[PDB]
Design a protein around this ligand. Structure first.
Ligand SMILES: [Ca+2]
Ligand SMILES: [Ca+2]
Ligand SMILES: [K+]
Ligand SMILES: [K+]
Lengths: 55, 98, 80, 98, 82
DNA sequence: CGCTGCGTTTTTTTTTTCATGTGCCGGTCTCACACGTGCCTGGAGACTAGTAAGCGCTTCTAGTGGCGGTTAAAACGCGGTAGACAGCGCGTACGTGCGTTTAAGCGGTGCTAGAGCTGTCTACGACCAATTGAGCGGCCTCGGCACCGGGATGCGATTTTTTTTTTCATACTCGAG
DNA sequence: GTATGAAAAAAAAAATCGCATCCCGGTGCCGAGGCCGCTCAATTGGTCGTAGACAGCTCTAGCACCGCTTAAACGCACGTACGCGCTGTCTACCGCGTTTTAACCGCCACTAGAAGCGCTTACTAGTCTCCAGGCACGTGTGAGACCGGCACATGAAAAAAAAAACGCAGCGGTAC
């Protein structure tokens, strides 16, 4: 459901891993349940700590 | 000429590598290391290409996750640079060392 | 050989950048090389134990999955 | 007048409690909490006295564990006072939270 | 009859925990922060425990329920029926 | 007036007491370890029997070299800038330790919910054939996504047009000729 | 003589500038999607046997009080040392442009070892009967905590003594 949504947002018909990653890490519960699970070829949610941003 | 101010290439180098998933260690180097480290536990072993990539997909996931924790520690010290005494604090709290 | 140095400075920096690290002390590079080696050693050990017990001289993806799952670092998308 | 300098008793107080093992939370209070918290899940429950004690041992051990992780984060920021931010950081790297 | 007991984990008691911690100096904000983390932790374990109690059609929570709960939560306790 | 040193008064630093909590010795009382005894259940014996697993042989995959070529990627080094670390000041939040107040603890005592065993019955799942059609390996195809450029779009960075205070010198104002 | 006024510099906001990232198509290739017929693993149906539902009974142990005792919690007060922000020095870590290197391709040929298929044996589960190990009772004696008296190393105070700003006084110098 969520990973299909993630694909449409990246204009893709075919769900790749990163869609699954994006889907899981942004759903609090699924993220909890898959807390110690590594998703292959799924990289990391974009996060950059505020105090690192300039100006 | 023109040049970007120390950091602004980094911030980009972040945005780039967060939005992507390609494995960031060179495949063959890694694989030699794996067989180096494997000879320890048994000689003349053989690996399925996939089994190397399974390891490489983990190592990278782990190190990435570590640096994340590392960075939050460096920042806790009102710093921006990561240093060994940030990794070590993470790994201690994680429970990898004593 | 000593293939650990084959984990070049720029590759570690690459990982750190995915990690969201802006600035990187020169020391880090060798430290990281250390932590990486521990991690590979530990996984590979249990992996190759799982291999040896099946009596195979070839390490499978499933060896490595089983290891990672033991080591508390479960992996999706290579079986298991 | 005789008084000990801030953080001298504190240090004694450490040595005392690190040498000993007894539960440091007065037991009735703790028990009352546990039942208050059991209501949130099922009305008119009952507890084996050993259950209540098996929790207090667990909680007290956890907290004492946290404050050690906590205390290394305070110290990481060249401090000595422990602050919510430190616990927050510790739970963060532990995995107790996002 | 005392609906807010989290308070009964008194500042001194938390100080002592922190002492066994090896903590020299304690911000005032802590106690409450601690009380809160305590609450979560008890809440989490006791949920799982009562689940185990309920699964056995018992009205009485056993020491074993609490162990099965602590083992799941990754938080394993020796000396109550382990 | 300005300095200069030199006796003064205070501050810093040393030395010696001193009041404190330590962990150290040796006698009393408690309930917890250890024994023991007798009963009962769960391990051992042994033999039956049926099937898992180990070894060799059959095939064929999928893992290990190895061979150059081009390119993207590391290496290295130089140059500067911003961030790490120390050092100053200020301010309040902790810490100690005193007195008031509270509620924990303790131990013995009386009820009663609910544990938990114990001996029944009966629906429910194992098992054991025989059947059959889904799910799996295998072969085509074709339509997403990956790679190309090419240009529009966003953003940091540098290099040019606005306040701010100050800074060193010039237009007004009282008596003077 | 004096209030005065425009130059320096500082700080800042805006416009080249250029630089790297997103969208528009066009190109092609490869991997997902889908059918094919073949194989075994799911279903059908029946019986044998046990697991567990059930209702009692038993007694446990969990609840809840009584009512002293005291320790711990609470609540103030005074002050100190820690947290925290602000600065300014230097150096180490980023950014960009030479030079060096080795990875990633798309081929090669060869072999092990993986992975499957069979046949044979020795290894387990499965009956039952029979002892003894092991546990739930009741007893007792001793380790250990608890109490209170000790020197005892201590950090906190008190008592002298080796320095840094403060008066205050002597005196030289210098224009007038
Ligand atoms: Ca019942
Ligand atoms: Ca004593
Ligand atoms: K093979
Ligand atoms: K009971």
């Amino acid at each position: 459901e969520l990973a299909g949504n993630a694909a449409r947002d990246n204009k893709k018909t075919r769900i790749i891993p990163r869609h699954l990653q994006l889907a899981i890490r942004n759903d609090e519960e699924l993220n909890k349940l898959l807390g110690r699970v590594t998703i292959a070829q799924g990289g990391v949610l974009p996060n950059i700590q505020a105090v690192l941003l300039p100006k | 000429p023109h040049r970007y101010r120390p950091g602004t290439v980094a911030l980009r180098e972040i945005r780039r590598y967060q939005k992507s998933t390609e494995l960031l260690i060179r495949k063959l180097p890694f694989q030699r290391l794996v067989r180096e480290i494997a000879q320890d536990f048994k000689t003349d072993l053989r690996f399925q290409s996939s089994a190397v990539m399974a390891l490489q997909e983990a190592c990278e996931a782990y190190l990435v996750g570590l640096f994340e924790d590392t960075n939050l520690c460096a920042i806790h010290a009102k710093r921006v640079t990561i240093m060994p005494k940030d990794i070590q604090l993470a790994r201690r709290i994680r429970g990898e060392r004593a | 050989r000593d293939n650990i140095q084959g984990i070049t400075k720029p590759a570690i920096r690459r990982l750190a950048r995915r990690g969201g690290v802006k600035r990187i002390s020169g020391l880090i590079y060798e430290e990281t090389r250390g932590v990486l080696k521990v991690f590979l050693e530990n996984v590979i050990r249990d992996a190759v134990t799982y291999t040896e017990h099946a009596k195979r001289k070839t390490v499978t993806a499933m060896d490595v999955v089983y290891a990672l799952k033991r080591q508390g670092r479960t992996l999706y998308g290579f079986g298991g």
